[PDB]
């Protein structure tokens, strides 16, 4: 294997041979690729159209270099709630808010997240502005999870060897195959998740990667472009369980949700998005609560897919009830306060 062979195959629009993506990703993670090579590869793979097998190789090699959490500190039913970002739409931090509501509903949450890449405020930025400790290592993440029912893996802390790819990603700006990797490389490896994909074409690919794992996942793409379950129109959901994928069109109007407009979900800077978290957790009704409740239910539905005691619709109805109740009973607000407390208590 070599760069000329691999890049030549991609620029020729051919799928890679098994092991080539892994070789490439290992060169990148070991600091052995020149920046030009990283970029050539990220771009060529994007334009060829990565397959699930290739992305699984990239994510899998990327995980082999991640700091793991300690043994037996992640419950087998932990859920993640996270997206690719890059939806260009600059919303309030839907995934982050859903994650808190889900945790407050009794579901263990280990969230992967990062600073904003192109928006004004990303999940980690908002959390930080809320006073949640984002900079914790493996041991303290595990303690957060055990003591608060929620943990945050700050991607730059857990994936230090990814620094070369991350710098190239930043230098080129254009979204690539690398943009898929964050959501696929949660260092705690939870088995469930609600995973948002901004890129209509690549969500099936992400589902394919989850399919090869023992996962229960909803890969979601709003039909308006959100890497979240949207309230402005239908969403496409790739349901992943038992090694297979069930693609479906999801309409929240079936659950009595009013259609929103994108600008009603718009956010601002970190302090502004932190303010929107406090509003929603405090009971404020309206389009943002609706989106949060919708996505939190999505996460609960994925969790339920693990110990599969329920069908699609009933699971949605119970997820929605649990997500609403976690807010209305103050449980989400209480859980955030406890999370901040835990962080201040070292």
Ligand X SMILES: COc1ccc(C(=O)CC(=O)C(F)(F)F)cc1
**Residues engaged in binding ligand X (CB under 6 A):** 114, 155-156, 159-160, 162-163, 166, 181-182, 185
CA dist., res. 269 & res. 320, Å (int): 29
Q: Can you give the length of the chain in residues?
A: 346
173 lies in the site for a second copy, by CB under 8 A: yes
242 lies in the site for a second copy, by CB under 8 A: no
Strands 109-113 and 150-154: parallel
83 lies in the site for Mg ion, by CB under 5 A: yes
CA distances, 129 to each of 9, 125, 157, 163 (Å): 45, 6, 18, 24
Q: Which is nearer to ligand PRP, 16 or 180 (CB)?
A: 180
For the bound state, the minimum distance from the C-beta of residue 292 to ligand PRP, rounded and expressed in Å, comes to 10
Residue pair 91/60 in contact by the 8 Å Cβ criterion = no
Q: Which is nearer to a second copy, 34 or 344 (CB)?
A: 34
Residues 6+ apart with CB under 8 A from 6: 16, 20, 23, 24, 41
* Partner from Mg ion, ligand PRP, a second copy, none binding residue 200, C-beta < 5-8 Å depending on class: none
The 3-state secondary structure of 245-284, one letter per residue = EEEEEECHHHHCCCCCCHHHCECCCHHHHHHHHHHHHCCC
8 annotated as ligand-binding: no
For the bound state, the minimum distance from the C-beta of residue 20 to Mg ion, rounded and expressed in Å, comes to 29
Site for a second copy in 6-25 (CB under 8 A): 7-8, 10-11, 13
308 annotated as ligand-binding: no
Residue by residue, DSSP assigns 101-170 as: HHHHTT--EEEEE-S-SSSS--HHHHHHHTT------HHHHHHHHHHHSEEEEEHHHH-GGGHHHHHHHH
Kindly state the number of chain residues that form the binding site for Mg ion, as judged by CB under 5 A: 4
119 annotated as ligand-binding: yes
Q: Which is nearer to a second copy, 177 or 296 (CB)?
A: 177
Choices 2-10, 24-32, 199-207, 222-230; region in contact with Mg ion by CB under 5 A: 222-230
Residues making up the annotated binding site for 5-phospho-alpha-D-ribose 1-diphosphate are: 83, 86-87, 91, 93-96, 111-119, 123
Residues that bind Mg ion (CB under 5 A): 83, 95, 227-228
Residues that bind a second copy (CB under 8 A): 2-4, 7-8, 10-11, 13, 34-40, 42-44, 46-48, 167-168, 171-176
């Amino acid at each position: 294997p070599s760069w000329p062979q691999i890049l030549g195959r991609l620029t020729d629009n051919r799928d890679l041979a098994r092991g080539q993506a892994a070789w490439a990703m290992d060169q990148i993670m070991t600091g052995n690729a020149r920046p030009a090579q990283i970029a050539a590869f990220a771009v060529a793979m994007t334009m060829k159209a990565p397959t699930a097998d290739e992305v699984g190789e990239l994510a899998g090699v990327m995980l082999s270099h991640a700091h793991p959490l300690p043994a037996d500190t992640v419950p087998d039913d932990a859920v993640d709630v996270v997206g690719t970002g890059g939806d260009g739409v600059n919303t309030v931090n839907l995934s982050t808010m859903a994650a808190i509501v889900v945790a407050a509903a009794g579901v263990p949450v280990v969230k992967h997240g990062n600073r904003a890449a192109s928006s004004l405020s990303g999940g980690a930025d908002t959390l930080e502005a809320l006073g949640v400790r984002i900079d914790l290592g493996p041991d303290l993440v595990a303690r957060s999870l055990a003591e608060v029912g929620i943990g945050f893996c700050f991607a730059p802390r857990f994936h230090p060897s990814y620094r070369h790819a991350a710098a190239v990603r930043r230098e080129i700006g254009v979204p690539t195959v690398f943009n898929l990797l964050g959501p696929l490389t949660n260092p705690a490896r939870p088995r469930a998740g609600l995973i948002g994909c901004a890129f209509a074409d690549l969500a099936e690919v992400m589902a394919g990667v989850f399919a090869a794992r023992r996962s229960s996942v909803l890969v979601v793409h709003g039909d308006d472009g959100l890497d979240e379950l949207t309230t402005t129109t239908t969403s496409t959901i790739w349901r992943v369980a038992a090694g297979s994928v069930d693609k479906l069109t999801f309409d929240p109007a079936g659950f009595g949700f009013a259609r929103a407009q994108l600008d009603q979900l718009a956010g601002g800077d970190a302090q502004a998005n932190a303010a929107a978290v406090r509003a929603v957790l405090g009971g404020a009704r309206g389009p943002v609560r609706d989106a949060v409740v919708l996505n939190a239910a999505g996460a609960i539905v994925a969790h339920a897919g693990l110990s599969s005691r329920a069908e699609w619709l009933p699971a949605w109805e119970e997820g929605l009830r649990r997500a609403s109740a976690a807010i209305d009973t103050g449980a989400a607000e209480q859980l955030l306060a406890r999370w901040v407390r835990f962080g201040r208590q070292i």
